[PDB]
Design a protein around this nucleic acid. Structure first.
Ligand SMILES: [Mg+2]
Ligand SMILES: [Mg+2]
Ligand SMILES: [Mg+2]
Ligand SMILES: [Zn+2]
Lengths: 102, 46, 71, 99, 56, 212
RNA sequence: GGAACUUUACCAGAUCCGGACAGGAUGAGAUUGACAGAUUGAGUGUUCUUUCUCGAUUCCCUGAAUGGUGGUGCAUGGCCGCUUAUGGUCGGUGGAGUGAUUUGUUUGGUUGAUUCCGUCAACGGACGAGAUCCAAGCUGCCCAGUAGAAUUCAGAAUUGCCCAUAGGAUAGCGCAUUCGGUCGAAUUCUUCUCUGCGGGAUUCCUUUGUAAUUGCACAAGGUGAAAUUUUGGGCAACAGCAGGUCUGUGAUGCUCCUCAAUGUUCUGGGCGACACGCGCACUACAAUGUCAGUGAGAACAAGAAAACGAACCUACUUGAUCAAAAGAGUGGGGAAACCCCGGAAUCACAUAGACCCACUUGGGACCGAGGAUUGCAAUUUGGUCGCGCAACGAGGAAUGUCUCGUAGGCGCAGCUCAUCAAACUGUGCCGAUUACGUCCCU
C-alpha cells in the first residue's frame, strides 16, 4: 500500500555494495516486499588540468576522475519498520536517504 | 625591479589632519539632535 | 611477441612438478586445475601459465625436459 | 577600518574566554559572527585579526593558519591575562578547561 | 569618505578579482567546475583527498 | 533546494581536505597518521590516528577540546553534534606520515642528514616493512644544492599496485640556509587482517599450493 | 594567459596603514568620524574653514615590525618538462686486475622488451620490461514506478476502381495497415537499456609451413565477439639537466622597498597602439559547387546560493491584428526523473527548384545607417538593411602530421565565462588512399 525508497550513494563501490547487501538482508529477515536493488548509472566527474605549474615544456595534461555509485531500494514498510531495518553500523563514505513515494 | 627612482611633486605635501581640541567644551555649551538614535555630528544631520 | 615471461615459466614448471598426474593435454581442463592449485591476483597470468603447462606436458610426453625433475 | 570600538573589543574578549579557541576567515570584508550566552553578535573580521595580532605579538595566544582561516587558542598565561583584563572571578576557566 | 572609497570596486561581486582559490586566495587559473573554486596547482596536490584519482 | 549528488560529494571532499590540512598543520609537532569521519544524524564523530595520543589529548582533554572547538567554529557545527577521538597507530614505523615528521624533527635538531635518514630506515626495517626509501634534497653541503637517497629492501615504483603497496609522505624542513625537502616511502608487508598492508597478494608473485 | 573595471604584476594621479609590539613625549580628553562651503577627476572631511561627534579603541618619534605578482629558478623546496620510447639500472658474495675498473649484465637464436632459450667465473638478488590499473569490444547474475518490450480489451483514422509534370527503378501476395495526446485501460515479460561482481584468448588449435635439429619462437590458416603486448590509455627504473617555475600557495634562504610605500585601495589610461618579420589557427579560391526547400538522423556532458524561496538550467505559450533579435508569462529539473522520444552537422532527395564556369548567386575581408542585449561602466555581443568592384581562381624555395573506425571531413558538449571561442579538453557522425616495408635520410 505505502511504499518507501532507500537511496544509497557513495564513492566507494565496495562500500555501497556492502551497504546495499546489508539492507537487502535486513529486509529479507523482516519479510517485507522488496522491489529489488536497482543500480542507477554510475556518474563520472572528470577534470583535466595542466600538469606543469608554470606553463613550460610539452603541454602535458592530467585527467582526474571520480565515480559515483547510486542504488535504490523500494519496499512496502511503515516508518518504524524502515527505521529498524536501516539502524545498524553503516560504513563511512556512504549515505542512505529515506523517501516516501506517492 | 621596481626601482625607487623617487617622484618630483607639482603640488605641496598635504598636511595630516589633527582633531581640534575644545578645552572644557561642555562648560561652553546646544540643540539636542532631533534624530532618534542621534549639525548633529553622530548623524551628520544639517 | 608472445614469449612467456620468466614468472609465467617458473610458475608453470612448479605446477608441473607439483601436479603431474593431475594435468592433461588440453588447455581448458589444465586452466581449471590451475585456478584451484595456484593463487594469483590476475587471470591473464593464469591463462598463460595454463598454456605453457600444456606445452610442457606435450614436451614431456615426447621426452624429458630441462628444469623439471619428476621424482 | 582597524579602529575597533571598546564594546565590540570586550565582547570578542568575552567570547575568546568562554570558548578556548576562536576561528575567523581571513577576509577584509565580511563579518565574523559569535555567540555569547545565546543570541548572536557580529564584528568585522579585520578588527578581530588586528586584535589577535596584538595578542600574538604580546605572546598572549597561539596562532595557526590553514585554508584562509585563522585558529587562535589561549595558553595558561593567556587565560590568566583574560581573567585580569575582564576582571573575571579567579578559578574561572574556559569551557575547554572545564571537565 | 575614505571608508566609502576603500575597496568600493571589490564590493561588487562580479569580476575575476572577486573569485579566488579557497586554499591560497589566488585569482588565477581557478577551477570553477562543480563549484570547486580551487586553483589548478592546488587541485593537483589536493585531488587525492577530495576523491579524484588518476585513471586512463 | 537540496544539493545534487555530484555536488554533495565535492563538498564532502573539500571539507575532508580542509580538515586534513588543518590537522596536519596543528599536529605536525605530534606524530599523526590520519583522520576519518563518519557522519550520522546524531553526530559527526571525527577520529584521528596518531602516535603521540597523550600529547594530542593533553591534560583533562585540553587539546582535544581545543581541536573540537576549532572544527566546530570552522564548520558551524551545532553544539553536541561533533566529537573528536584519538587512536594510537598499531605500528609506528609503518606510517610514512609519522616517520617523515620524526625525520624532520631530527633534521631540525641539527643532526647529520645521513645519520638521521639511516636511523629512520633502521627503525622502519625493524618495524617489519618490506622496504624503505628516504630522500633528502637541498643545500646540505653548501651553496650548491644536492639530493641524497638512502634505500633498503624492496621498492616498486611502477603500475597502480604501488599506490596501494607503498605509503609515501613529503614535508619541507626550513633551516637557516633555506628549505630542505624530506620524503619517506615505505613498502607495507601484506597482512590478511587488512589493518596494515594491502591485504592482497602482489601482482607479480604467483604461489602454487602444496599438494595434500 | 579568451585582460572593459577588477584581475594587473605597467603608466598619470589621488586614499588608507593593514608599522603589530616595546620605550619615550602627551593625554579623559589620547583620539575617531564628519554637514556645509573649496580642495579636487572626484554631493572624495582627501585636506582645509567650521563647529559638532566619538571616546583611551588611537595617536606623536625611536628602534622595531609588516606586506610586496620587489629581486635572484646561478641560494633552494616542491612540481613539471626534457634526456628517453626506447630497454634500460644496481648491490652482495665469489673470480680478474698495482690500480682506476671488470665479470656477472657474454655471444648464438628468440622477442616491443636485459623478452625468453641455450651458453657461461660466476652464484644469488633488487629495480625497470612485462604484471598490476582504467576505459572499448562479446557474454553470465542482478535490476527497474529515474529503463524498456510484447500482448489483450476498448477509442478512434485510412480503406480500393482510382496511374503526375515526361513519372523510371526499388520487397511483400485464422488474420489489411496505422494512431509516444487516444495523455486510453488491463496483463505479462526483460530482445534493447541500466550495473556491482563474474566469464572469455591461452599461441589455444592445424600445417608433410619456417625454424628446431634441445629449446625459445615464428608464418599462414582454424576457432571465435575479439587472434596477438586484443585495443586505446594510465603507471613507469637509474642517472642527469645550473631546463621552467622565487607570477599557484601561510613553499622558502639571502637581499630590496616600507606611511607623497616596491604595502594597500581608488580614479583615468595600458596590457588589444603599427611599416614590418615569424609561429599557430580559422575562412576561401566554386559545379564531387552555391543558394532555396523537404527528409532522416548521434554521442560526451552540464544545470539553482551563506549566518522559506530567490538566483542555475530548461520546456511551453505569448509576443503575433504580422521581420529578426528581443521581451513577457506559465510550468518542470538538484539531473537515468526536466530539458529528451535528446529532431546536431556531415548526408539524403525522381526537389522533374534556381544558377551555368564567372572572381560569378564563388568569396566574405572592410565599412555605412537603425535597433536590441550583457554589464557599475560597452565610448562587448547578437539581429536587420546596405558595402562587396578585399584579396583569393589552388600557392616558389621550403616544410607538418598520420596505418582502421585510422587520416580527412562534419558537428556537439564541457571549460575559462556578467558579456565574449577562429583556443583547448572531451564526444559522437561520415568515412578513404597507401604501406604492411626499409635503413636512403633523420
Ligand atoms: Mg632565464
Ligand atoms: Mg637558467
Ligand atoms: Mg587559450
Ligand atoms: Zn590555490
Amino acid at each position: 500500500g505505502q511504499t518507501v525508497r532507500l537511496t544509497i550513494t557513495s564513492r566507494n563501490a565496495k562500500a555501497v555494495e556492502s551497504v546495499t547487501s546489508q539492507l537487502l538482508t535486513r529486509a529479507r529477515d523482516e519479510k517485507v516486499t522488496i522491489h529489488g536493488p536497482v543500480r542507477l548509472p554510475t556518474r563520472t566527474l572528470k577534470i583535466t588540468t595542466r600538469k606543469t605549474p608554470c606553463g613550460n615544456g610539452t603541454n602535458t595534461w592530467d585527467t582526474f576522475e571520480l565515480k559515483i555509485y547510486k542504488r535504490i531500494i523500494d519496499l512496502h514498510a511503515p516508518t518504524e519498520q524502515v527505521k529498524k531495518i536501516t539502524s545498524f553500523t553503516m560504513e563511512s563514505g556512504v549515505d542512505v536517504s529515506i523517501t516516501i513515494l506517492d | 625591479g621596481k626601482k625607487k627612482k623617487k617622484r618630483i611633486f607639482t603640488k605641496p605635501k598635504k598636511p595630516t589632519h589633527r582633531h581640534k581640541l575644545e578645552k572644557m567644551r561642555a562648560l561652553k555649551y546646544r540643540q539636542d539632535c532631533p534624530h532618534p538614535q542621534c549639525y548633529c555630528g553622530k548623524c551628520h544631520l544639517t | 611477441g608472445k614469449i612467456r615471461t620468466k614468472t609465467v615459466k617458473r610458475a608453470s614448471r612448479q605446477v608441473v612438478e607439483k601436479y603431474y598426474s593431475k594435468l592433461n593435454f588440453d588447455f581448458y581442463q589444465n586452466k581449471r586445475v590451475i585456478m584451484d592449485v595456484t593463487i594469483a591476483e590476475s587471470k591473464k597470468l593464469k591463462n598463460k601459465i595454463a598454456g605453457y603447462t600444456t606445452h610442457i606436458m606435450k614436451r614431456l610426453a615426447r621426452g624429458p625436459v630441462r628444469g623439471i625433475s619428476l621424482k | 577600518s582597524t579602529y575597533v570600538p571598546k564594546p565590540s573589543r570586550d565582547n570578542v574578549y568575552r567570547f575568546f574566554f568562554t570558548e578556548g579557541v576562536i576561528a575567523c576567515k581571513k577576509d577584509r570584508m565580511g563579518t565574523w559572527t559569535g555567540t555569547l550566552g545565546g543570541n548572536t553578535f557580529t564584528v568585522p573580521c579585520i578588527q578581530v585579526m588586528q586584535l589577535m595580532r596584538s595578542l600574538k605579538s604580546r605572546n598572549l595566544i597561539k596562532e595557526q593558519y590553514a585554508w584562509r582561516h585563522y585558529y587562535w587558542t589561549l595558553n595558561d598565561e593567556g587565560i590568566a591575562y583574560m581573567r585580569s583584563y575582564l576582571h573575571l572571578a579567579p578559578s574561572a576557566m574556559p569551557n575547554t578547561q572545564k571537565p | 569618505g575614505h571608508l566609502d572609497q576603500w575597496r568600493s570596486r571589490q564590493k561588487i561581486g562580479m569580476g575575476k578579482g572577486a573569485r579566488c582559490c579557497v586554499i591560497c586566495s589566488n585569482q588565477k587559473a581557478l577551477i570553477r567546475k562543480y563549484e570547486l573554486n580551487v586553483c589548478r596547482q592546488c587541485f593537483r596536490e589536493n585531488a587525492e583527498h577530495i576523491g579524484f584519482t588518476k585513471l586512463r | 533546494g537540496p544539493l545534487s549528488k555530484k555536488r554533495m560529494i565535492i563538498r564532502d571532499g573539500v571539507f575532508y581536505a580542509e580538515l586534513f590540512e588543518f590537522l596536519k598543520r596543528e599536529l605536525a609537532e605530534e606524530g599523526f597518521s590520519g583522520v576519518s569521519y563518519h557522519v550520522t544524524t546524531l553526530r559527526t564523530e571525527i577520529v584521528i590516528k596518531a602516535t603521540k595520543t597523550r600529547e594530542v589529548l593533553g591534560v583533562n582533554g585540553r587539546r582535544i577540546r581545543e581541536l573540537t572547538a576549532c572544527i566546530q567554529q570552522r564548520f558551524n557545527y551545532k553544539e553536541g553534534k561533533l566529537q573528536l577521538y584519538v587512536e594510537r597507530v598499531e605500528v609506528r614505523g609503518l606510517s610514512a606520515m609519522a616517520q617523515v615528521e620524526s625525520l624532520r624533527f631530527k633534521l631540525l635538531s641539527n643532526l647529520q642528514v645521513r645519520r638521521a635518514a639511516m636511523g629512520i630506515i633502521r627503525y622502519v626495517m625493524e618495524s617489519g616493512a618490506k622496504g624503505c626509501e628516504v630522500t633528502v634534497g637541498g643545500k646540505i653541503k653548501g651553496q650548491r644544492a644536492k639530493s641524497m637517497t638512502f634505500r633498503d629492501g624492496y621498492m616498486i615504483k611502477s603500475g597502480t599496485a604501488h599506490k596501494s603497496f607503498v605509503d609515501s609522505a613529503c614535508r619541507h624542513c626550513y633551516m637557516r640556509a633555506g628549505c630542505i625537502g624530506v620524503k619517506v616511502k615505505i613498502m607495507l608487508p601484506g597482512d590478511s587482517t587488512g589493518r596494515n598492508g594491502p591485504s592482497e597478494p602482489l601482482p607479480d608473485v604467483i604461489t602454487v599450493i602444496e599438494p595434500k
